[PDB]
Nucleic acid binder design. Structure first.
Lengths: 359, 165, 178, 146, 131
RNA sequence: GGGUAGCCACGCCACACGGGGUAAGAGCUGAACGCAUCUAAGCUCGAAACCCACUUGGAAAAGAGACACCGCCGAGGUCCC
RNA sequence: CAUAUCGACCGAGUGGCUUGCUACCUCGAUGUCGGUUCCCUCCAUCCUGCCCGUGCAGAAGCGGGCAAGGGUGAGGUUGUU
RNA sequence: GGAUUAAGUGUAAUCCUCUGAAGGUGGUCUCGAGCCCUAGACAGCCGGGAUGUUGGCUUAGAAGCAGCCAUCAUUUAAAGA
């Protein structure tokens, strides 16, 4: 036709959860695992960067601007609880957990510190009931004899310091892909009691998919849903209405064709985001730089967007999608598809643009 | 063209010159070929041209399919051998839709009764096994004349059998 | 049905329709399963077998089987090699074999004298010998004739080009020898 | 698992000839499964078998949208479907003995014990003078994604 | 080849821009630009770097009337960079060119972009000023 | 007359390859038919097309799934602000 | 030099886009032409991929095969198609 | 009981309705016709394809092989102007 819009994401509902849930995980060999194959914090707006060109066959091996783009604030994040899954037929099902007696002092909301008495609302993950071993044993025994499935960890990003966030942490399980299994099972156990950061699984130059719900409005008409033609002038005054949808035996149309509905919202990954930078907020410089405890490298003066200043661990993900927006939560990944080869541990990052957003 | 509602007999008589005028002249050159006069009949090698069908080839059908035939009979040095015979003539006249007689298919027009089709062409008809047009001479070659009629057939609505001498 | 007995010097020993061959040259196996057929068994001599069957259908088979064997016999003792020359118009061709069929492995370079090398594949157990001189002969050999066959071939064909016309250019390598 | 009554092999075996039996027997009451769907063969082939079947070239799948119907892709479904034909699946003892039959994917049968052949519905693929290329099962459903 | 510089398309078809000299040029108006695609509510597009087909609206000589082509030298719409962030600057722009790609007018009024030179030299050449 | 934020495009960023199987075709080994033969069994290659790869949706897939942890007198959840 | 290519006569078909026929359907009424917008499809393929032939040196073509993944517009006169 | 078919031909009495007229197959079975064979065929298969002389004429050429005339002789195991 071509058909307007594209089937793919479907149906195109709203999005359950405003947290992305990656459908697939990288498959790996020569791996730890990460546990946090995916690890993420979320968006502040972004400027642009001047970057040295990397290593192309091409002549350009000099300064060039790329949208140093949407710097997202991450991390650190903690994985409390590696969860086993074991046995089919049916599908994956949880086994038993692990634990952690660290309990970030804010993980009450959406977690612990639930009323002891049962509440009509279901209780979230809270635990004082502990059996570190037993869980370990259960998993090990259901390893040799039965099975196990890929193991993952709970994770929860803390809002140690982000503009307008709270003890609430909305985290979801990220899988660990190590070697055999039992080797990896050990790995997720070590990185259990303990905490992590981006500088773990990550690397500048390395490509990662990014996922998050798009920001967007509620139901709208056909035109700015999948694009549809407006007009012609008659019912021009009225809202854009597509020609009748399907006509024949079924009275109703399944259609797959232009219908009003929710838009905005989403849940979609992007593929092969390069991660030009890794970063921080603490001052570190090859040579003398500003002093008096300056701030993060890339946050615009005037703050950025509604939620300003960054002063801690960052990530720059060029050509910002980001697959969502301002102060939401993207999830990082590893680049499952991959195309071009990885670049380097770092990029030159000759200049970063810092300017008030307005102006 | 094409000849469709032309050569299937679903009608009955006439030709009748009394009745009809304005008949188109045939475009079928003489039905006497090769050296006539002398009895070609004394010959080795024989005949062909069997229809193997029903009927009504038009003069348009026979006249370029027959001299087409003769043309590759020329191989036997112009005037030297065989006589060609054609059998049946294109008597039979056909009429075509002149909107006045009846309705629907041809030989029917508009209204009821009225214009029979106006004269346009004539075609001879033939039976299941008749000899469309024959004659031969001694085995000049393998059978150039047999080659003739290969071409001769292939412009007849019917499937003609070569038929051996 | 038929019976083939041979040879001494080469063993047999097939089980569950796998079949085999022996040596001294390396052995080849071939499934040889199709339709109710015996899938010939060694009968304390040589293998040859028939299944009660009908006419043509099985018959096309258990004929073919006969030919697969008896060319497994000669592919085990005194192997099979195909041999033939490379050569054409100006500038020679570079044929050389590096391990494996893989791209930028199996030979050929300047076909006419083009850039980019084009060649694959090699069969499972075939050996690619090389030219006596700079380049003017190839020997392809191996126990199975069914790998050695389309190795030398699929090396001739890897010269074939559908473009101008074969007439004008006559590059390529052909295995004239059988 | 499902309780077998008479499990039936289906290796070199014409599919309909088998499922034209167990879908008779099924009707009478009998419970059970054919295994080795996967190697179960129908004759005539490598063309108007790939097509008018379920390949992604057959276009059986990917045929339509909100109207259907859809066919099957796995060797199980592919000749499960055959079983529904030859059964009044819609209602009564139809979808009854229907449900009470399963086809299993399998290499040698997944259940311990070899199951019986049927009244001669056998390939007899050996020196096939009568035989010709007939290959189906998994292969059809392999060209098509599993 | 590669512009190496991102460009947003400032002007669509039917747009009127200024020739930065041809002979008797004036203000050409845009007609489809090079091989380009379309979509519903396509609005063809054009931008610095993309060869365009055009007609001469203003003129003087009997250049006016039409046929073309010309390449858009400058545009008012942003750009991109390699270093900094970039500009849009002047008014839009365009110079007629031959199928060779050479200018069909000796002098080019106005400046020209750097990575327009890369795409077509000779155009950048008789620049007068770059950047 | 000027114009912040936001929303926008005329602005900016990102959108492969490769692998597997084929068609037409190019070939190999090879009989029927001692030879010849790209085909009959077998095989090497070979299309923007097919499958995969990649993006999106997707436990209501009735075989209605898996895992870890918390919990059954209180885990969690709804209301509330 | 039939068959690179063009290809009559005659013969056999396929499609259901044009036109005609049916006067078979509707006159207690199936809203016109053209346009527009929005979806799907057909081949019998215009481009792109892979191929064969050539009256194929090359370049540019011409003709044919597989193939429907993607692509295949903007204006001036005219209500016009 | 017997035979044919490899195209899913077909599994379609009749017909608006079931098309198909004047693409291919050394897959296999059955039937017929011509010629050649134990004075040894095909392969039938394998190998070879004499001197005057390019016969005379004609022709731009015409050398066994456009055409006309002639069709001898030699050396032979044999070999036509």
């Amino acid at each position: 036709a071509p058909r307007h819009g594209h089937l793919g994401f479907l149906p195109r509902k709203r999005a359950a959860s405003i947290r992305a849930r990656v459908k697939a995980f990288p498959k790996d060999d020569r791996s730890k695992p990460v546990a946090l194959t995916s690890f993420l914090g979320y968006k502040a707006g972004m400027t642009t960067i001047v970057r040295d060109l990397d290593r192309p066959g091409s002549k350009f091996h000099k300064r060039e601007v790329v949208e140093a783009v949407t710097v997202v604030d991450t991390p650190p994040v903690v994985v409390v609880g590696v969860v086993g899954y074991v046995e089919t037929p049916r599908g994956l099902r949880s086994l038993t957990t692990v634990w952690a007696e660290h309990l970030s002092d804010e993980v009450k909301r959406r977690f612990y510190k639930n009323w002891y008495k049962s509440k009509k609302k279901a209780f979230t993950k809270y635990s004082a009931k502990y059996a570190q071993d037993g869980a370990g044993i259960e998993r090990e025994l259901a390893r040799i004899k039965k099975y196990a499935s890929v193991v993952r960890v709970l994770v929860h990003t803390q809002i140690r310091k982000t503009p307008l966030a709270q003890k609430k942490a909305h985290l979801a399980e990220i899988q660990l892909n190590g070697g055999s299994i039992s080797e990896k099972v050990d790995w997720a156990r070590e990185h259990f009691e303990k905490t992590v950061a981006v500088d773990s699984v990550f690397e500048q130059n390395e490509m990662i998919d990014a996922i998050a719900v798009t920001k967007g409005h509620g139901f709208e008409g056909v035109t700015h849903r999948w694009g549809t033609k407006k007009l012609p002038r008659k019912t021009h005054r009225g809202l854009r209405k597509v020609a009748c949808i399907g006509a024949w035996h079924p009275a109703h149309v399944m259609w797959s064709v232009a219908r009003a509905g929710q838009r905005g919202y989403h849940s979609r990954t992007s593929i092969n985001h390069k991660i030009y930078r890794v970063g921080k907020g603490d001052d570190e410089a090859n040579g003398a730089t500003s002093f008096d405890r300056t701030k993060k490298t890339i946050t615009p003066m005037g703050g950025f967007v509604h939620y300003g200043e960054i002063k801690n661990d960052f990530i720059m993900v060029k050509g910002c999608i980001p697959g969502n927006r301002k102060r939401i939560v993207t999830l990082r990944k590893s680049l499952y598809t991959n195309t071009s080869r990885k670049a380097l541990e770092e990029v030159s990052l000759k200049w970063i643009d810092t300017a008030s957003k307005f102006g | 063209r094409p000849a469709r509602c032309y050569r299937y007999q679903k009608n009955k008589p006439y030709p009748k010159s009394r009745y009809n005028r304005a008949v188109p002249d045939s475009k079928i050159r003489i039905y006497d070929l090769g050296k006539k006069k002398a009895t070609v009949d004394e010959f080795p090698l024989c005949v062909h041209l069997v229809s193997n069908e029903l009927e009504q080839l038009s003069s348009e059908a026979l006249e370029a399919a027959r001299i087409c035939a003769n043309k590759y009979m020329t191989t036997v040095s112009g005037r030297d051998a065989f006589h060609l015979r054609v059998r049946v003539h294109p008597f039979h006249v056909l009429r075509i839709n002149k909107m006045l007689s009846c309705a629907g298919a041809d030989r029917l027009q508009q209204g009821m009764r009225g214009a029979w089709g106006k004269p346009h062409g004539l075609a001879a008809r033939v039976d299941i096994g008749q000899i469309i047009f024959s004659v031969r001479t001694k085995d000049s070659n393998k059978d150039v004349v047999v080659e003739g009629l290969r071409r001769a057939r292939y412009k007849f609505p019917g499937q003609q059998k070569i038929i051996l001498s | 049905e038929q019976q083939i007995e041979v040879p001494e010097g080469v063993t047999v020993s097939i089980k569950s329709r796998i079949v085999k061959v022996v040596g001294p040259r390396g052995t080849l196996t071939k499934n040889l399963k199709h339709i109710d057929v015996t899938f010939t068994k060694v009968n304390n001599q040589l293998i040859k077998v028939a299944v009660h069957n009908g006419g043509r259908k099985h018959v096309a088979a258990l004929r073919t089987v006969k030919s697969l064997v008896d060319n497994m016999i000669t592919g085990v003792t005194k192997g099979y090699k195909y041999k033939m020359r490379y050569v054409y118009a100006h500038f020679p061709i570079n044929v050389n074999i590096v391990e494996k069929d893989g791209a930028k492995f199996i030979e050929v370079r300047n076909f006419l004298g083009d850039k980019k090398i084009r060649n694959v594949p090699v069969r499972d157990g075939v050996t690619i010998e090389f030219s006596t001189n700079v380049k003017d002969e190839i020997v392809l050999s191996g126990n199975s004739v069914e790998d050695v066959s389309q190795n030398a071939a699929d090396l001739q064909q890897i010269c074939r080009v559908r473009n101008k016309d074969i007439r004008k250019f006559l590059d390529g390598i052909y295995v004239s020898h059988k | 698992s499902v309780e077998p009554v008479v499990v039936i092999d289906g290796k070199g075996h014409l599919v309909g000839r088998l499922a034209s039996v167990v879908a008779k027997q099924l009707l009478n009451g009998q419970k059970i499964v054919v295994v080795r769907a996967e190697e179960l063969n129908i004759s005539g082939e490598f063309f108007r078998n790939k097509l008018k079947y379920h390949d992604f070239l057959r276009k059986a799948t990917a045929f339509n949208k909100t109207r259907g119907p859809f066919h099957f892709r796995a060797p199980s479904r592919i000749f499960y479907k055959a079983l529904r034909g030859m059964v009044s699946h819609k209602t009564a003892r139809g979808k009854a003995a229907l449900e009470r039959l399963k086809v299993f994917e399998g290499i040698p049968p997944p259940y311990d014990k070899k199951k019986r052949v049927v009244v001669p519905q056998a390939l007899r693929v050996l020196r096939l003078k009568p035989g010709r290329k007939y290959t189906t099962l998994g292969k059809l459903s392999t060209s098509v994604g599993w | 080849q590669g512009t190496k510089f991102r460009i947003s398309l400032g002007l669509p078809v039917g747009a009127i821009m200024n020739c930065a000299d041809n002979s008797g040029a004036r203000n050409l108006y845009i007609i489809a630009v090079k091989g380009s695609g379309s979509r519903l509510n396509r609005l063809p597009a054009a931008s610095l770097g993309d060869m365009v087909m055009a007609t001469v609206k203003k003129g003087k000589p009997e250049l006016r009337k039409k046929v073309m082509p010309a390449i858009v030298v400058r545009q008012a719409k942003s750009w991109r960079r390699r270093d900094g962030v970039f500009l849009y600057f002047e008014d839009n722009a365009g110079v007629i060119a031959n199928p060779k790609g050479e200018m069909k007018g000796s002098a080019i009024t106005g400046p020209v972009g750097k990575e327009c030179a890369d795409l077509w030299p000779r155009v950048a050449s008789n620049s007068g000023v770059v950047v």
